[PDB]
Amino acid sequence: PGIVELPSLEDLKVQEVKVSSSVLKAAAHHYGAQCDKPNKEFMLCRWEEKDPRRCLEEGKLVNQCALEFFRQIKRHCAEPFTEYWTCIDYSGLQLFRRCRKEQAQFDKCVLDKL
Amino acid sequence: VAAFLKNVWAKEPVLVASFAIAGLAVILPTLSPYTKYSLMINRATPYNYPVPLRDDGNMPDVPSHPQDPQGPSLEWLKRL
Amino acid sequence: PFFDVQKKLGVDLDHWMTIQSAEQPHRIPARCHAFEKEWIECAHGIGSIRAEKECKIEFEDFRECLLRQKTMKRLNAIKRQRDKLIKEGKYTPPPHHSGQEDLRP
Amino acid sequence: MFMINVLTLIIPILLAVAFLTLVERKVLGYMQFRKGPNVVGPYGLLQPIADAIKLFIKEPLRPATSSISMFILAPILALTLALTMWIPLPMPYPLINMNLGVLFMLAMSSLAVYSILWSGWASNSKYALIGALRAVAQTISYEVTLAIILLSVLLMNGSFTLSTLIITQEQVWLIFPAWPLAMMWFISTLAETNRAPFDLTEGSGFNVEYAAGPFALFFMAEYANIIMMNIFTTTLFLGAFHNPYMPELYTINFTIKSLLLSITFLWIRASYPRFRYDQLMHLLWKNFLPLTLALCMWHVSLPILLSSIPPQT
Amino acid sequence: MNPIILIIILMTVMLGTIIVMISTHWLLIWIGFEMNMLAIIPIMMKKHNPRATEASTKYFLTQSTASMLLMMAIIINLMFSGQWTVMKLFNPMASMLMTMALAMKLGMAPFHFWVPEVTQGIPLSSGLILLTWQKLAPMSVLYQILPSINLDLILTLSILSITIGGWGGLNQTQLRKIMAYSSIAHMGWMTAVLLYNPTMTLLNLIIYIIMTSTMFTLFMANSTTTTLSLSHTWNKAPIMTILVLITLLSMGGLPPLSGFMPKWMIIQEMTKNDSIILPTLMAITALLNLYFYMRLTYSTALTMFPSTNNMKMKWQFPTTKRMTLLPTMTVLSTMLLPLTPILSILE
Amino acid sequence: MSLVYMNIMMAFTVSLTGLLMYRSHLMSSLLCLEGMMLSLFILATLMILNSHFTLASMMPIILLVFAACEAALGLSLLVMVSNTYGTDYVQNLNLLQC
Amino acid sequence: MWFEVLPGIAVMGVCLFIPGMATARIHRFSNGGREKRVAHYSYQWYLMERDRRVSGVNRYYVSKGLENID
Amino acid sequence: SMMRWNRERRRLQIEDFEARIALMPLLQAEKDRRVLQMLRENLEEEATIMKDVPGWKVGESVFHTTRWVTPMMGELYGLRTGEEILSSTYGFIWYT
Amino acid sequence: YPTKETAHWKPPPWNDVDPPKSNLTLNFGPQGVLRLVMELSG
Amino acid sequence: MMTYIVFILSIIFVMGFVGFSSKPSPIYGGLGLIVSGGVGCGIVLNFGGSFLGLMVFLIYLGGMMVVFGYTTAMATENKVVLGTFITGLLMEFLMVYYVLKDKEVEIVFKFNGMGDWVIYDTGDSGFFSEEAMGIAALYSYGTWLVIVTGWSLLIGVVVIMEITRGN
Amino acid sequence: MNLMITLLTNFTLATLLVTIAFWLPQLNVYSEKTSPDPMGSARLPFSMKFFLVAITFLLFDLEIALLLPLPWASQTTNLNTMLTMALLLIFLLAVSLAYEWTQKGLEWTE
């Protein structure tokens, strides 16, 4: 039959979000609030096209807005967010309920400064 | 109904307790004001991704951002 | 005979476990959901005699999604040719096919 | 490194089984107004070592067995299932943190009757076969109420995971919503392990045609199952406070509660006469099983009428 | 047996057959067969003698082997089609295994080797259930999978069933082995016309069930299990000899009787499809069935075998058996050939 | 197709030919029948897990329950045969030849 | 008197204390001074494999924070 | 007590699931780039291997459709070594 | 039609019932002391 | 070698089936079926069917083979056995030798020669086992299935108490 | 993989202690003794009642096997149907027990 049509390796290069899963889960609700629109354009395009080849540019915009989000956390609230994701990172199941005061400090610093 | 039940509670207390617990388990979920909240929680636990809708132009009851006031909320679950 | 009581009464006794494309718990799709949905929507209502010779390509795609005979045959072919070229020495694998390159994300 | 973890699990199991015999003989000594062993060691501490070295140098009894292969494979399966029940146990961290640890323990404890059945086959006697079939019928009878009591408790857990059963029991012990299931569970674990007042094998046994070495092997498999069922009951009903920065608090706490529960086994065999065989069959099928089905219906319908269906995760 | 328990068990047999009929899922077909066997085992063990336990054991082994072959056919259908609809099968190997499994449940030759033993060991009511009601479920499944049934396999099974059920009943003097080899031959007739026009399969099924229920009801009303005890019936009640005369002449395929109807419509529908040697061989083979039917009529109705003295006491007592639908079934099994285009109601 | 399906189908045919060729007993025939059931269980489980057809995950449990009830029925038949003849040999079950 | 059962109870309690303390110390030793990552569900395993890929040195328990982005 | 605590546990479960839902589009974009990276690698190495074979077309889809088919495990980890294969095909199942 | 093969077949009984064609004894030996010779019925 | 673990367990499964299907004795037949049940359960466990595997160990080997051994213990108490054993064993090793030197065989259907790791899915199922949720849907979806299975087991109880009575 | 190594280690230690317990007193000769039980020479009587309790276990174990997904079935969206069918399965287990009871099935091993 036909030849499957794959994008080249230059087409897939992007600046990755090179952080851990506990760093992602710690900043997750602020991410889902602040990175709403490109994430939802990407998942709408992903369930409508039903093909990752037709969604690469929306995926790059997701991978761009995520890095913008973590740049804006890093400029103003590096130390309280680090104190928070270390406490999330200790646990095996990565509980939120073990880490309420560090979350309260991070939420206070983010609500004030950002 | 009063002397038979005392007679069987004297003879066979295990089976009387068994039928009483089973009868409570049968009838009591229909008499409870909290049976609705179990359903309301189980249909509000997000296992899958809430796949967004294409904004056709006429949807006043679907939000555009999760923090928007319109849409289903879980105020009742935070409070109870 | 097939006394279709479930349609005469309109009750779903066992229509739900019948196919993979039916309503699943927590919307979990099967691995060949789209292939089976396309075969069913192709061959619906036209009877089996027309369905076996007019939806031949959709059913061949769905059987090939299920058993993956052509895919595993192709990978047998590629791995056999590659082992011949490695044994004759006429080819060497790149470092991303030996595990030396710090995978993508 | 993981082999170090397997060894530091399964060697202190054997040492605790060894000194359980000393604890048992001392505690049943003082409950019978006498002293336990205190001649051999300093207050008897060298008694299980002496008993082990005696039982491993005694003559093989040598029956001309019907099956030599099952005469070998019954103690192998007895010790193997005796040691593999311990690997999913969270205390506070389990060795093999499996998603279905409760059902795994129920399955591997259901498999433990083949040691009894094969050790009745391997002996040539008809009466040992009859006694082995009576013991198998007893154990498979009480496995039913193990399963249903276990399910009725796990409806308050949400899953089959053993480590979630600590998270379930943070605000209160799970004996407070489920004390009838707790007391029937305790008698059911007491009647699984052929323990008094359910030890009709002590009242001729099934495995008397083994050597004293393999007698010690069945004996230590039985006591490993006793300490295991008590630790599993402590995890299941009397679960303790878990601080993730000091695991030793949960380890001290479940160890103290499990020692008190194993001593409760020792204090129950020293107080009651044996049931007759049809009386423990009566106790199961006509006393525990109606209550177990009734409380199973109650524990199905109770998180629905209280809006307290526990989480899956 | 306790009558409440017997009613519950018969409702479970009927429920298993209905679950095979009305369901669209292969697992529910298999559940219906399992429930049907599980409930029919006590009906054979109603008298509690070692012949009935031997018959129930042989029946259990054959129907369980057929159930496992049926589930393997279902599983290969799931391999090669990914679905569970009870429709055509999507593999010739699965079609072969399901035709073999249904042939074992029908007791068609060369899997026929259980039917006279199991039929002989059990009473006449359970034998009636075995030879009528247990045919309804596998013939329904064969009616549903006929777009995938192999032609040569089902025709080999059909002619081999007809010939072995012909030669088996000749040597028999027991009535129940005669009815069992009658069953093998008539299932051969029913499955021969299955791929051509299965309405004639349903017609042969219904007319066979009417004739077999007539013969077992006559055998129950006379309490006869051998030829030589059937032969005393003229000295007890000659109307029963008349009814077994006309019904055994019916079952062999003599006109104007309605047992000529199924095989004549089968011969009629196999000549449309350019098979002429095969229905002729089938018809010529059915003369053996008619031969041992004629032997039973010679021993019962057309002659008078000598009876004993104790028949003089049974002269004085009326038959208090509930001969349920025996005149209705005997009328429907003899005088129905003037209503032969009634077969369109089965289409 | 897959390589493991060869082994599981061959396992079913091996236990089939064990069931279809009696040696001495009826209990060995019941064990062959339940080996057939076991191979059917493993094969159905591999297909249902491999396709991610989620609703058929309840199907092997129904298979195991029904055929274990079937096995209990067969064990009861063997017990009645053994009470009649002392043993469970199949050559004792030959009274229906005539 | 009665307090002589307590040496045997003490030895048995230490022998039951050893495996839980040992598996806690081994899980903290082999995971960078932390608890073992629990992966009961495939999403937990996907995040754990993602940690192992983003860590660079092929260990899921090497965390990379905001020092790894620009 | 179990009523209050299981209701609190359901609230914690919803918080963790919504943390997952907030993370899911980034993980989906990275997973899609991951699988397209691996398929492009297999295509390029199939091009540099399958030059000796007559009549072979590289990247030839076995399906007759132009729809994207979700790639098989052997279609991704076919040309890679056994450690990566085992880590991806029994990593979750054999994990403790 | 009696051949050489089917020559030893006698007809079955008239009520389909064949004839049936015990209990355990335990000698509890001396192994105070007392030898009991039981006869049990299950 | 380790990529063929499901194949190795399937070979042990077939070897156990030739072991007890050659029928040395019902005792050793039950032993071979218990070893086969464990290794086929391992086959199920290596595809992620953890709950179905524990259904095997709890129900099959825990109830049913216990009852088969319990009945073999009280209702029963060579050259052909070992010859048929090495017949089935050499035929199975001929099949494995063919499919490993050839990477393609066809006894009845065509079979691959690689490992069956290749046929998996590369995704994740989130916070649920798909097999566990499919079994959990036996109550909400499978209502008719539960009705007929409970009725079949109740009828099974009634049937066993009828036919095992002697009267 | 950790689980298979753990099973292998447990089986190996069990087999090691069995090998020691069988072959450590084989150093001890002690004799070649001849050594020629309640019953003398009677064959094993069958007891119907042990078989009845074995089949009762097997059928109630199958009903338990149907009951085992209840901690997961509690999480469903269709709770009325789930609660009805859960109570129906436990009630069918109780009906099976009551029929086992009243027809004297639980007698002399009650």
Ligand SMILES: CCCCCCCCCCCCCCCCCC(=O)OC[C@H](COP(=O)(O)OCCN)OC(=O)CCCCCCCCCCCCCCCCC
């Ligand atoms: C609808 C809810 C579900 C109901 C069904 C399920 C019950 C759940 C528990 C499972 C029980 C399983 C076993 C049930 C068997 C019942 C029959 C029985 O045991 O009868 C015998 C018994 C007398 O015993 P006997 O015959 O001497 O036998 C030797 C033992 N002594 O006879 C008796 O002891 C008499 C028993 C009948 C009278 C019991 C009355 C109890 C009343 C309690 C208060 C009201 C509760 C409301 C619901 C009532 C439902 C009946």
Ligand SMILES: CCCCCCCCCCCCCCCCCC(=O)OC[C@H](COP(=O)(O)OCCN)OC(=O)CCCCCCCCCCCCCCCCC
């Ligand atoms: C987590 C904790 C686990 C603990 C497990 C063990 C519990 C028990 C611990 C030991 C208890 C007390 C041991 C000492 C008992 C008495 C020994 C003794 O004094 O023996 C004297 C004996 C004869 O002396 P002799 O010189 O002949 O006499 C003339 C003297 N003027 O001379 C001899 O007998 C020779 C010397 C023998 C010494 C034996 C010591 C005991 C060994 C027990 C095995 C376990 C050891 C610990 C293992 C775990 C730690 C690694």
Ligand SMILES: CCCCCCCCCCCCCCCCCC(=O)OC[C@H](COP(=O)(O)OCCN)OC(=O)CCCCCCCCCCCCCCCCC
């Ligand atoms: C008479 C014979 C000889 C007798 C003595 C020796 C045998 C008896 C004692 C050992 C019994 C072995 C039982 C092995 C299977 C136990 C079930 C099991 O593995 O369950 C645990 C787990 C399921 O939990 P889950 O959390 O889902 O898995 C991790 C992914 N999240 O599953 C996993 O984690 C899956 C891990 C990979 C698959 C493991 C498969 C193990 C090998 C199969 C059994 C081999 C032995 C066969 C014979 C056994 C006895 C019948």
Ligand SMILES: CCCCCCCCCCCCCCCCCC(=O)OC[C@H](COP(=O)(O)OCCN)OC(=O)CCCCCCCCCCCCCCCCC
């Ligand atoms: C496409 C088709 C779909 C399905 C349509 C319907 C199919 C009908 C299939 C008929 C199957 C009949 C099975 C046997 C009878 C069923 C009832 C029963 O169990 O009767 C047995 C009962 C036992 O009484 P008992 O006292 O134990 O007798 C022996 C000891 N004295 O009582 C007796 O023994 C009483 C004696 C007389 C029994 C006569 C029963 C006649 C039944 C058939 C009626 C005619 C057929 C219906 C029309 C054609 C349908 C195909």
